[PDB]
A paper describes a structure:
Pyrimidine-specific ribonucleases with homology to bovine pancreatic ribonuclease A (RNase A; EC 3.1.27.5) are remarkably widespread among vertebrates. Current structural data indicate that catalytically active members of the superfamily typically comprise a polypeptide chain of 119 ± 15 residues, have an α + β topology with three conserved disulphide bond positions (SCOP12 code 54076), and employ a catalytic triad of residues (two His, one Lys) to cleave RNA on the 3′-side of pyrimidine nucleotides. Recent surveys of the data from zebrafish cDNA and genome sequencing projects have led to the identification and characterisation of RNase A homologues in this species. Our structures of RNases ZF-1a and-3e are the first ichthyic ribonuclease structures to be reported.
[name] cleaves tRNA with a specific activity that is almost identical with that of human angiogenin (hAng), i.e. some four to five orders of magnitude lower than that of RNase A. This is the first report of its activity toward a polymeric substrate. This is reminiscent of hAng, in which a similar obstruction is posed by the corresponding residue, Gln117.21,29 One residue upstream of the obstructive residue, the main chain begins a deviation from the neighbouring β-strand that marks the beginning of a novel C-terminal conformation. Overall, the C-terminal conformation is less obstructive than that found in hAng; notably, Val125 points away from the B1 subsite, while its hAng counterpart, Phe120, encroaches on the pyrimidine-binding zone. The binding of RNA substrates to hAng requires a major structural rearrangement of this region, and the same appears to be true for [name], which most likely underpins its low level of ribonucleolytic activity. In [name], Lys85 lies adjacent to Thr51 and is the counterpart of the modulatory residues Thr80 and Asp83 that are found in hAng and RNase A, respectively. At the B1 subsite of [name], the position of Lys85 and the correspondence of Arg106 to Arg101 of RNase 4 suggest that this enzyme will bind uridine more avidly than cytosine, whereas in RNase ZF-3e, the positions of Thr86 and Arg107 suggest an ambivalence as for hAng.
Residue numbers in the entry: -2 to -1, 1 to 126
Amino acid sequence: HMQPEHVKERYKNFLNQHVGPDMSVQRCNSEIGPNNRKITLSGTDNGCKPVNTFILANKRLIKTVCGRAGSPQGNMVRSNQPFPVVKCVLNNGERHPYCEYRGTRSTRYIVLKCEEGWPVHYHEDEVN
Ligand SMILES: [Cl-]
């Protein structure tokens, strides 16, 4: 429960954007939208993210990728085993409440950036 002060907000936002143990392929719009997580494109006024991946696992398991269950990839880490994910890809909309997505489930190695052992960034594919 205790977190480094400079990590707290980045970690909170990592959980919000990317930790979705209960997420499903057909709930991208509801989960991303203002009735739930209100996930927004960084640096924008309520802008729809082009892509947002939810890892279908709990935060405890995902955090282990920052340590024993990951391997180094530059200054990031790559999971040693793959995870189930739902990738939400933008279909329509500029800003909330109009962000509409298609969700696709896959199993994939996840690449994260960690700080002090805490996940702070999920590395999305360049093209989605
Ligand atoms: Cl790996």
